[PDB]
Structure formats: structure tokens, C-alpha cells
Design a protein around this ligand. Structure first.
Ligand SMILES: [Fe+3]
Ligand SMILES: [Fe+3]
Ligand SMILES: [Fe+3]
Ligand SMILES: [Fe+3]
Ligand SMILES: [Zn+2]
Ligand SMILES: [Zn+2]
Lengths: 346, 346
């Protein structure tokens, strides 16, 4: 039946028109400072590096092993991993999302601009994450590929509205935050697969995280350059995003069966510690430290307000969650269509 | 090393600005006439419907069968199928490509416009094609998934410039043509897999073709509505596309090894009859018949020229190829990295 829809009213082009040049001029900078964070394709890993080799005499035992190993991984973990993969699979959305950003958008799909080249290349690198996880999940035999496939269709057709308002200020702060968010997630699913005694699974999550660490560096560099060129406007963007809260890229998630699928998935991510509310705050605190927002001069009346709010927010959010956490009650066990309606503790 | 790049000079916004409304107003029409050609997600097939069931006691024998069956399929066919799949996999490009089209582009990634909803939904349906083919190819064990994965990365990062110039006139004629092109391809790979005695493979190609037939109907309806609303401009678009020739969506194809990969792939598609130059002309002739271009009144000096040229082109192209075909010499055998450098006849 009917999937979820963005409840917030839609806003387009919140950025002043003239300033687009600030991104048209930074073309040279981008080549020297963002395009370096790209791996040449020949040097890149590919999903096959991490999956059974179908053209190998060892393919059968390889798959048989992957599957033995999988049994020892509990369902809750699978639910999280699946959510992850579904997010990663909705990639066509995210390339489209970067092609709405006013200062950078690829005008033809093959535009030689540094910004477009970065976009096409980043998409290319991300495409690997979906594939690798998909085939791992598929072979594992622990999840319901059909329902997962269905969720993905519902997701791609729903789209996303990250409320970036076509602003590269907001957009690049979003991606900055998101890329770090998945990085923490993946590193935890890595660290947790290690614990469940599956190193080959750890490696999968591991090397995806690698890509995210690199992408995050690229985006945290673009924000750093915007803090120097436009100290006030960047602070205004950074504050604006924090008040709206960062709505995750896969929140319209729907399996034809759970009207609050994303909330439930996120709850399982929480209990296991793949991505907690602490992590959310920790990311923020890191970005304030990374951009040295604590120390900036030349701020307008609203800018100083936009600064202080942002700077005091991490200990605030942490403590907000703190007391919510030490009052949270026992959560119910709920079925997930991703796992044939087997039940995990929320 | 370095992939191929678009040799033609880039052109943006070839459409007059005012007319965008003709696409802003057709929002209602689109809901009644294009959105109907969408399958509800619950009714859609998913790749799992066509692949071994990893959560089934039968998974092992299923895979073992898929693989036995594959051996009987010759390498040349695999090369074509692989090209196909690589094209289909570069999907994020094509969603981006539809979001450059001036009259339809999704402004936020979640815009409630009939045009955006169609875009997100079509992308969602297409995502299934890549997956299904990918996993089939993977399990088969007859192709080199790593090299295929690499090609895909080179492709997504290269992008495409279909020379639609942000015009929905040109763009929707392009997609109209492309969707029919893949339809003929897939139906032939279906019909050919039948012949090599693999019905489960035929079914895969079969049900993908199904999606393409539907998409083609939707797009050939949008052109039909543009032939009625703007008889002259549509003919001008249709002529313009034919003179530039339709550059296929996967032409920048590169495996780090073959500087003319796309030409060689296309040559194998040709020899086998998956997609010949005849087919190209046959599609054209069908579209002239489909849109009744043969019979249109009220055409400008250039429009009548744009009409006649287009109408006489199918027997022209066919005969051009005819004599090229009856003079073509024996083609060399060439290695493909998609098949571990085994060699097929071009
Ligand atoms: Fe990713
Ligand atoms: Fe990412
Ligand atoms: Fe397709
Ligand atoms: Fe298609
Ligand atoms: Zn994918
Ligand atoms: Zn895909």
C-alpha cells in the first residue's frame, strides 16, 4: 500500500543567485584539493575482491563457508546491515541529490567541471558499496532478498528531501555529516562482525568505511574553504541544518508492511550501538573541532547567535539523550519483513 | 589509464525558456497518461523471483544448475549480455540525465510533480534490471566480475552526454528510442538464450524487456502529445536527433584495457543479431509510423524539410547498411577483459 511522504513543506533555492560564481570560480581549487581525494579506478577495490570467486575451483566451499559463518551472526545485526545496504542501494537518489545543488550541478551528465567530475566519480565509488553488500546479503541466506528488493524500489521511488534547499552550503554540510555517520556505522558493524567471529564480513564493512573516511575528508575540506571565504554564511548554514535536524537519507523506508520502518530499523541500530544518538552528538562535536567554529572572528548579530548555539549543542544533545536513555523502558520485540518476519528486540 | 571522453562540443539549454510551462502545465495530463504506465510496487517482480533462492533447501542445486546451463552458452553471447548489464548498471547516470531536462527536472529529489514522481519511479523499476543481471552473471562463473565491476566504475565516472541539450523534446525522443532499442536487444538475448537451451535465462531477459515495452509506451505517448501540441517543434527535435545520430548511453565504456571497448562490444551485438543497424532503422521506421509523421499539416519551411528527411531516412539507412553489410569482410577475433581475455569473433 502507500509509502511515507516528507511531512515538511518543500523549499527550493534558498541561496542568493550571484554567489553561485563562488562555486564556479573554485573550479581550480577543487581540482587541487578535492579531486586528489579520488582513487584512480585501476587502484580501486571492487566487490569481487571480497566475495566468493565464481570462476574459482573454490567457489563452492567459499559460499558454503560464508553461509556457515552467517548463522553465527544474530538477526538483529542482520536487520542493521540490511538497512545499511538498502540505504547504500538507493544511490541513484544521491547522485540526483548532488545534481540539484545550485553551485555544483552537472549540467549535461558529462560536463568537464571539477564539481561534476567529482560527482560522477563519487557516485562510481559508491556504487561498489551497494553491490558488495547486496551480494553478501544474498549469499548469506539469512535475509529476505525479495522484501529487501521491494524496500529498495519503494525507496528509490520515494526519493529524499534532505532539506538542503539547493544550497551547497547546506548540502556540503549535510554530506559532510552523512559521510561521517555511515563511517561510524560501518566501523561498528565491522568491529561487531569481528566479535561474531566473521573476519571476511569485517573486511567488507571495513573497506567500505575506508571510502567514507576519504569522502568525508573531501567534504570537510569544502566546508573548511567556505568557513574561510564566507565565515558568516557558513555558520548560518551550519546553524540552519542543526535546527532542522539532519533527516537521514533513507527515512522514507517502506517494505509495504511497516508504516514506521525507518524508526524501527534505527531503534535496532541504537540498541546494538552501530549508530547511537551519542554518535550523532559526537560527530557534531568533532565538526566544531574540525572547523574550529569555537574560534572565528567577524560575525554578525545572527552569526554569533548561530555560532554559540552550534558550539553548545553537543554537550546539550548528549545530555538530552543521557536522561532519555536512563529513563528508556524495555523495548518490544518486533517482526521485520527483511528477515521473514522473525523478531528482534527494538 | 585514461578513459574515452565526449569528442563533441557541449551544449546547454537549447530550448526557449518560456515553453517550460508547456511541461509545467502538462502535470495533470502526465498523471492521467504517464503515471498509469507504472506498476504499483507490490505488484512488481523483484530480481529474487528469477535467481536461486538462498533461503531454500534448493539453493545449492539451483546454483549448480544455473552454472551447468551457463557452460552451454557461448562466450560471444556472454560478451553481449555483459555489455547490456554494464549499461543497465550505470543507472545513476540515467536518473541524473533525466534531472537535467529543463521541463521535468526534480527540483529537490522528493518534489511531488508528476514528472518527478515518474522519474523516481522509473529509476526504481530500472534498478531491478542491473541487480538481476549482475547476480546472474556473478553466479554463472563465465565472466570476470572484477573487470566488469571496474568497467562500471569507469562508466559511472565518465557519465554520458546524450546531446539532449536539456531539451525534453530531444530528451524524450532519445529515451523513446533507447527504451525500444534495449527492448529489441533483450528480446533477442531472450530468444537466443531459449535457443542455447536456457529458459531461466530467457525469463530474465524476457521480464526485463517487459519493463522496457512499458517505459517505451509511456515515452512514445509523451512524444505523441508533443506532436499534437507543437507539431513543428517536435519535428524539429526529431530531425535534430537523427542528424546527430543517437549516441548510446554506454559509449564511454572502458575496462582499463580496450580504448575502443564500446565499438567492439557493439560489433559482437551486431554479428549475433542482438542489436543490428537494421534494428536501428526498423525502430526509426516504427516511430514514423507510430507518430504518423507521414501525415502532419501546418509545417514551416524548415519543418517540411525536417519531416521529409526523417521519413525517407529508414529505407535510406537500411540500404546504406545493406551494401556495407554485403561488402563487410571477415572480422578478427579479439580478447575481452570481461571474459578473462578469452576471444570472440567480432
Ligand atoms: Fe556508501
Ligand atoms: Fe557514502
Ligand atoms: Fe533497463
Ligand atoms: Fe530502461
Ligand atoms: Zn546497486
Ligand atoms: Zn545496481
Amino acid at each position: 500500500f502507500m509509502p511515507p511522504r516528507e511531512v515538511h513543506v518543500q523549499v527550493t533555492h534558498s541561496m542568493p543567485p550571484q554567489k553561485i560564481e563562488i562555486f564556479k570560480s573554485l573550479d581550480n581549487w577543487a581540482e587541487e584539493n578535492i579531486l586528489v581525494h579520488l582513487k584512480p579506478v585501476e587502484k580501486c577495490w571492487q566487490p569481487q575482491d571480497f566475495l566468493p570467486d565464481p570462476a574459482s575451483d573454490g567457489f563452492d566451499e567459499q559460499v558454503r563457508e560464508l553461509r556457515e559463518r552467517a548463522k553465527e551472526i544474530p538477526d538483529d545485526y542482520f536487520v542493521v546491515l540490511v538497512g545499511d545496504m538498502i540505504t547504500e542501494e538507493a544511490l541513484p537518489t544521491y547522485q540526483t541529490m548532488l545534481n540539484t545543488l545550485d553551485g555544483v550541478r552537472d549540467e549535461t551528465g558529462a560536463s568537464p567541471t571539477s564539481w561534476a567530475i567529482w560527482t560522477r566519480a563519487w557516485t562510481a565509488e559508491e556504487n561498489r558499496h551497494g553491490d558488495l553488500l547486496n551480494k553478501y546479503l544474498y549469499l548469506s541466506g539469512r535475509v529476505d532478498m525479495r522484501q529487501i528488493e521491494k524496500t529498495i524500489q519503494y525507496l528509490i521511488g520515494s526519493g529524499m528531501d534532505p532539506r538542503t534547499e539547493n544550497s551547497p552550503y547546506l548540502g556540503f554540510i549535510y554530506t559532510s555529516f552523512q559521510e561521517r555517520a555511515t563511517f561510524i556505522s560501518h566501523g561498528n558493524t565491522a568491529r561487531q562482525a569481528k566479535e561474531h567471529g566473521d573476519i571476511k564480513l569485517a573486511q567488507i564493512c571495513g573497506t567500505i568505511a575506508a571510502d567514507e573516511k576519504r569522502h568525508e575528508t573531501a567534504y570537510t575540506k569544502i566546508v573548511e574553504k567556505l568557513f574561510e571565504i564566507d565565515p558568516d554564511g557558513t555558520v548560518l548554514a551550519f546553524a540552519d541544518m542543526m535546527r532542522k535536524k539532519i533527516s537521514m537519507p533513507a527515512h522514507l523506508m517502506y517494505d509495504g508492511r511497516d508504516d514506521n520502518l525507518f524508526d524501527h530499523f534505527s531503534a535496532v541500530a541504537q540498541r546494538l550501538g552501530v549508530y547511537t544518538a551519542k554518535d550523532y552528538a559526537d560527530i557534531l562535536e568533532f565538526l566544531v573541532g574540525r572547523w574550529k567554529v569555537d574560534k572565528l572572528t567577524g560575525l554578525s548579530a545572527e552569526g554569533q547567535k548561530a555560532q554559540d548555539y552550534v558550539c553548545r549543542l553537543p554537550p546539550r544533545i548528549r545530555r538530552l539523550e543521557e536522561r532519555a536513555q536512563g529513563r528508556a523502558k524495555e523495548a518490544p520485540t518486533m517482526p521485520f519483513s527483511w528477515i521473514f518476519d522473525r523478531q528482534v528486540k527494538l
